[PDB]
C-alpha cells in the first residue's frame, strides 16, 4: 500500500464508529453543529475514512491511536465557519478540564479566507495545540482559504504516487506560500462506511492532512514535550527522503 497518551480530535462528518478499523478506539463525542441539507457517498463516509487513515487498526498511519469525533459537517459534507468555531471551543474546554498534555486536531475542511476562524486557530495554538488542516482542493493559492491560510495551523497539500501535485476533478491540490508541507493524498486506502468490513480509496488534501496528523501523533508519543516549532521542523524533515 503505497502510502505516552496523545489525543487526536477530528472535526468532520459523522463517523461509523462500529467499523472494524476504528471500533473501540474512537470516542464519539456528542458535539454536533451542522447546517440543514442543501450525491452518491454516504452521510458518514468522509469522516469514517479519515478516522481510518490516521488511526485505523490495519490501514492507519498511527495504528493506535486515540480519537475523538466532533460533528461539524452535514451529510453533503457541508459545515459553517460558526459551527467550526464552536467545535474548536468545545476542544479547548476539554483541554482545560481533562488534561493530559499533547493534543492534535485534524481539520479536513476549508472555506474562504476567514479572519475569525484563523484567530480561533491562533488562540488554540498558543495553548500548545497541534492543528493540522487541508490546503484545499481548488488548484488555487491556499492563502485564499481558511483554516489553510493560518500560519500556526499546519497546512498540508496533496502529492500523488510520483510525488507530484494531486489532480482532482477539473481542480486539484492548493499551492503556494501558505502550504507548509505536502503528504500522500491520492488513492488513500482506509475504512469505508459502506459496510463495517469495507475499505475505500479516496483522494484529496483531507487525506494528506490525516497522514500528517498520524505522524504528528506518533512523534508526540515518543517525545510528548516537543514545541510546535520543533514538531514542525521534524515533520518537514520527515516528509523528505530524496
Amino acid at each position, epitope marked *: 500500500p503505497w502510502n505516552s497518551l496523545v489525543e487526536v480530535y477530528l472535526l468532520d462528518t459523522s463517523i461509523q464508529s462500529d467499523h472494524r478499523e476504528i471500533e473501540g478506539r474512537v470516542m464519539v463525542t456528542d458535539f454536533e453543529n451542522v447546517p440543514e441539507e442543501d450525491q*452518491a457517498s454516504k452521510c458518514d463516509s468522509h469522516g469514517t475514512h479519515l478516522a481510518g487513515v490516521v488511526s485505523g487498526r490495519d490501514a492507519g498511519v498511527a495504528k493506535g491511536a486515540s480519537m475523538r469525533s466532533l460533528r461539524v459537517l452535514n451529510c453533503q459534507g457541508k459545515g459553517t465557519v460558526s459551527g467550526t468555531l464552536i467545535g474548536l471551543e468545545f476542544i479547548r474546554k476539554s483541554q482545560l478540564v481533562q488534561p493530559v498534555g499533547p493534543l492534535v486536531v485534524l481539520l479536513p475542511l476549508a472555506g474562504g479566507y476567514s479572519r475569525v476562524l484563523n484567530a480561533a486557530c491562533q488562540r488554540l495554538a498558543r495553548a500548545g495545540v497541534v492543528l493540522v488542516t487541508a490546503a484545499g482542493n481548488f488548484r488555487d493559492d491556499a492563502c485564499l482559504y481558511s483554516p489553510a491560510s493560518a500560519p500556526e495551523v499546519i497546512t498540508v497539500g496533496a502529492t500523488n504516487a510520483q510525488d507530484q501535485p494531486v489532480t482532482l476533478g477539473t481542480l486539484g491540490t492548493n499551492f503556494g506560500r501558505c502550504v507548509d508541507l505536502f503528504a500522500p493524498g491520492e488513492d488513500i486506502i482506509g475504512a469505508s462506511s459502506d459496510c463495517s468490513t469495507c475499505f475505500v480509496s479516496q483522494s484529496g488534501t483531507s487525506q494528506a492532512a490525516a497522514h500528517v496528523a498520524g505522524i504528528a501523533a506518533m512523534m508526540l508519543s515518543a517525545e510528548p514535550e516537543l514545541t510546535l516549532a520543533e514538531l514542525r521542523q521534524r515533520l518537514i524533515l520527515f516528509s523528505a527522503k530524496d
Partner: antibody
Amino acid sequence: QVQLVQSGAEVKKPGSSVKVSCKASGGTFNSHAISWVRQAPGQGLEWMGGINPILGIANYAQKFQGRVTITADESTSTAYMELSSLRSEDTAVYYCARHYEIQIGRYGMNVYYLMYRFASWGQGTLVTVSS
Amino acid sequence: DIQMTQSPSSLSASVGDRVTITCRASQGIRSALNWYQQKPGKAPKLLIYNGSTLQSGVPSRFSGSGSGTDFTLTISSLQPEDFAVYYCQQFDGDPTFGQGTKVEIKR
C-alpha cells in the same frame, strides 16, 4: 479440484513460533484472499485474521494483534500464518479458508468489500504446544 | 467484537424430524449470517450464507431464516448424514462464530 492444501502437523515448545502454510491449487487463478481460523480440541471456531492481496493489507483479529503476522508469497499461490509466543492454549487445529475482496464501488470508487464467506477450506494443521 | 450465542448445545432427533437450531447476535447485523456443518475430523462446510440463501450444491431440506438479531437454521426432514455439529457465523463483522450445536440421534 480447486483446493487449499496446508503444511503438516507441528510440535512447538512454549515461547517459540509456528509458521503454517496454505497453498491454493487447481483453478485458473490461485492468488486469493485467505483467512486463518483455529479450533482447540473439543472447542469451536475462532478467526485470527486474513491477507487481502488486492487491498494489499492484512486484517488481524483484536485477540491476536501483535502475535500473528499473515503473509503471502506472490510467486507460489501460498499464504502463511505465523503465530509466536506460543503457549499451551495455542494447541489447536489451524484452518485456512478463502474469503473475498469484492469490488462494490460506483462511479467509481474503488470500494473493496471484505466478505467473510468461508466456502473453501483448508484441510487443517494440528499445532501442539508442550514443554 | 460482535458476539454470537447459539441454542441449544445439544439436540436429539430421528430421521424425518424437523429440527431448528437458533442463533443470536449481540447487535443488528441485517442478515450477514452464515451456517456451517462440521463432522468429526473435517473442516467446516458452508450450507447457508446471508441468512437464507443456499450454498452451491447444498440440499433444499436446509433453510435459513431471520433478520436483525435472531436467526434460525431449519433442517426440514433429517437424513442420516445430517447428524453433525452446526455453527452460525456473522460477517458484518470481523467474523465471529456461535459455540455450536450437536445434532444427535434420538434413542
